Amino acid sequence: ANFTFSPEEVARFERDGYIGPVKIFEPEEMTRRWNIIRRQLLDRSLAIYPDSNGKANISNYDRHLDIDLLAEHIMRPEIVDRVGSLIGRNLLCWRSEFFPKYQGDEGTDWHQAATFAHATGKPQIIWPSDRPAFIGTITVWTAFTHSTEQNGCLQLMPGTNYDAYPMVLKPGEAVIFWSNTMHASLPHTGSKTDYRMGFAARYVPTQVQVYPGTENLTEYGDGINLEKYGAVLTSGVDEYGHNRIARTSQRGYEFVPRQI
Numbered sequence: 001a002n003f004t005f006s007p008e009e010v011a012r013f014e015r016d017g018y019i020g021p022v023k024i025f026e027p028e029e030m031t032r033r034w035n036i037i038r039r040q041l042l043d044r045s046l047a048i049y050p051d052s053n054g055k056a057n058i059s060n061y062d063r064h065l066d067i068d069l070l071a072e073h074i075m076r077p078e079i080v081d082r083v084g085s086l087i088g089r090n091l092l093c094w095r096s097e098f099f100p101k102y103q104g105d106e107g108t109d110w111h112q113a114a115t116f117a118h119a120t121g122k123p124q125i126i127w128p129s130d131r132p133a134f135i136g137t138i139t140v141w142t143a144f145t146h147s148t149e150q151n152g153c154l155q156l157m158p159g160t161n162y163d164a165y166p167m168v169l170k171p172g173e174a175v176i177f178w179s180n181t182m183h184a185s186l187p188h189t190g191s192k193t194d195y196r197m198g199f200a201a202r203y204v205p206t207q208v209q210v211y212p213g214t215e216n217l218t219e220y221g222d223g224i225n226l227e228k229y230g231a232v233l234t235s236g237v238d239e240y241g242h243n244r245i246a247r248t249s250q251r252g253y254e255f256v257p258r259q260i
């Protein structure tokens with residue numbers, strides 16, 4: 001079993017800043033899992049972040065650190081072998097978050113997101129640098145429900161300032177892109193019972209510093225509390241040790257690095 005990208009695939013990712021759809025799970029399997037996960041999300045008894053109104057809580061950040069199925073999701077070979085083909089075999093999953101969309105939600109115009117924390121503007125991800133430090137993170141956006149044009153799917157732009165495709169996904173399919181890739185989104189114009197649920201997991205090679213400058217902090221903002229936070233070594237080895245790391249989830253799920 002190997003899901004590394006071909007030189008071709010890797011090439012078009014380099015060209016577009018994204019690649020998708022890529023199958024992670026069969027639609028029925030994804031749905032089966034999401035049926036469990038959806039209910040488990042409700043129990044926060046072991047969630048690493050406390051009750052708050054910050055987006056870390058409201059958008060359920062890093063539940064892969066306490067929900068078994070999410071813990072397994074970020075470890076999946078279908079995800080890891082692919083991301084590894086892009087930024088290396090020594091991979092860290094430093095975050096996961098949910099992206100729901102409901103009837104009436106508006107779309108967004110063309111833009112690119114930054115990895116700075118909203119509450120403080122502090123950079124969350126810092127790459128090694130000679131002066132400006134790169135701050136991007138490969139994001140794996142998995143459709144837990146279908147992502148359609150009708151329910152507000154994302155929009156990606158081919159090629160890379162200058163030199164409108166809808167990324168529709170079936171449950172279990174994912175789109176992989178740099179967190180700062182140019183994108184937009186359509187408004188949700190479907191029925192009120194048709195919600196879209198995307199689960200995003202973000203990865204950075206081991207040499208990247210996650211949550212820099214927080215050595216003596218816990219309360220970080222936006223509901224994020226680093227006390228029980230740790231990045232997960234998804235594959236390879238960590239020759240750095242400069243990041244908070246979680247070898248095990250709050251429920252005892254052991255994260256055994258995959259040797260692509």
Ligand SMILES: O=C(O)CCC(=O)C(=O)O
Nearest residue numbers: 106107108113152184185
């Ligand atoms: O969900 C949406 O409607 C837009 C999402 C978006 O623009 C983003 O995640 O960068």
Ligand SMILES: O=C(O)CCC(=O)C(=O)O
Nearest residue numbers: 113114115116117118179
């Ligand atoms: O994950 C990202 O790309 C940005 C995250 C962010 O801005 C935040 O958590 O406040």
Ligand SMILES: [Fe+2]
Nearest residue numbers: 108111113183
């Ligand atoms: Fe966006």
